[PDB]
Amino acid sequence: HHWGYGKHNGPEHWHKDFPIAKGERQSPVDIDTHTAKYDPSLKPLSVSYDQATSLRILNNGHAFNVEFDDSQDKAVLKGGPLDGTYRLIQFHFHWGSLDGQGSEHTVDKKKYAAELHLVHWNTKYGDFGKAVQQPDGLAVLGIFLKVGSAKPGLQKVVDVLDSIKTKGKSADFTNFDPRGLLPESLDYWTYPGSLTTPPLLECVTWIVLKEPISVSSEQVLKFRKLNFNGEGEPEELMVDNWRPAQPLKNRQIKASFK
Numbered sequence: 111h112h113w114g115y116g117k118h119n120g121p122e123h124w125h126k127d128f129p130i131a132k133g134e135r136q137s138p139v140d141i142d143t144h145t146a147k148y149d150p151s152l153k154p155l156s157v158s159y160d161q162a163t164s165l166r167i168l169n170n171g172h173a174f175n176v177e178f179d180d181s182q183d184k185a186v187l188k189g190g191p192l193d194g195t196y197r198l199i200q201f202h203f204h205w206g207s208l209d210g211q212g213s214e215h216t217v218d219k220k221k222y223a224a225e226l227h228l229v230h231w232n233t234k235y236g237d238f239g240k241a242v243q244q245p246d247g248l249a250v251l252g253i254f255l256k257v258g259s260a261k262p263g264l265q266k267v268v269d270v271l272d273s274i275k276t277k278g279k280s281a282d283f284t285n286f287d288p289r290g291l292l293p294e295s296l297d298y299w300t301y302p303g304s305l306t307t308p309p310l311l312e313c314v315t316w317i318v319l320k321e322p323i324s325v326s327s328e329q330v331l332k333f334r335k336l337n338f339n340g341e342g343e344p345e346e347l348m349v350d351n352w353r354p355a356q357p358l359k360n361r362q363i364k365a366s367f368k
C-alpha cells in the first residue's frame with residue numbers, strides 16, 4: 111500500500127506516512143500575483159545548460175524522469191534567490207487527465223495543463239542525498255505548460271515514451287538538450303517550499319517561471335498514455351499525478367519582475 115495519486119493512496123493520505131505533509135513550508139502553493147512582491151534583492155537568474163549530459167529516461171511509477179550525469183559541474187542554476195551553484199540532476203512533469211488541470215502550482219488559482227520540474231541540488235552539500243538533509247539543499251525550476259502550438263524541443267521526450275510505458279522501465283536517453291524546454295522569459299516567482307511528492311522534504315527553493323511553454327494536444331496526449339502500473343498489471347493511466355496547492359503559512363512569494 112504505497113503512496114500514489116488514487117483515492118486510497120493520494121495526497122490526502124500522504125500525511126500518515128509522511129507527517130511533514132502538514133508542515134510549515136509545503137509545496138506546491140497558489141501564487142497570488144497581486145500579493146507577490148517584486149524583490150530588488152534578487153540577483154539575475156542564470157540557467158546554464160549548454161553542457162548538460164542526459165543519460166536515461168525512467169518511468170518510476172509516479173512520473174518519468176529524464177536523468178542527467180551530475181558528476182561534474184555542467185548544467186547549473188545560479189543567481190536569483192540562490193546562494194551558490196545548483197546542479198541539474200533530473201527533470202520530470204506533472205500533468206492532468208484533461209487540459210484544464212495538471213499543474214501543481216497555480217497562478218491566481220489557475221491550473222495549467224502540466225508543469226515541468228527541473229531539479230537541482232546545491233553543490234555545497236556534495237550529493238543529492240546530503241542536499242535533502244538541508245533547508246537550502248535543492249532548487250526546482252518550475253515551468254507551466256499550456257496546450258497550443260507544439261514545443262519542438264519536447265518531441266524527442268514524447269517519442270521515447272512508448273519504450274517506457276510501465277513502471278520500472280527505462281531507456282537510454284543521451285544528448286537531450288533541456289534548453290529546448292524553456293520559454294523566452296526568465297521572469298519568475300520564488301518562495302521556500304518542499305518536494306511535492308513523498309518524502310515531501312522541506313529543502314526546496316522554488317523558482318516558478320511566469321511564462322508558460324506551449325505544447326500540442328498531441329504531445330500531452332502521449333504523456334497520458336503512460337501507465338502508473340507495471341508491465342502485465344492492470345492498466346491505470348498515468349494522469350493527474352499532481353499534488354494540489356498547500357497552505358502558504360508564514361511565507362511570502364517574491365517576484366523577479368516589476
Ligand SMILES: NS(=O)(=O)c1ccc(NC(=S)OCCc2ccsc2)cc1
Pocket residue numbers: 175177178199200227229250304305306307308309
Ligand atoms: N516534484 S518535485 O520536483 O518537488 C520532486 C523532486 C525530487 C524528488 N525526489 C526525488 S527522490 O528525485 C530523485 C531524482 C533522481 C535520483 C537519481 S537520478 C534521478 C521528489 C519530488
Ligand SMILES: [Zn+2]
Pocket residue numbers: 202203204227306
Ligand atoms: Zn515535480
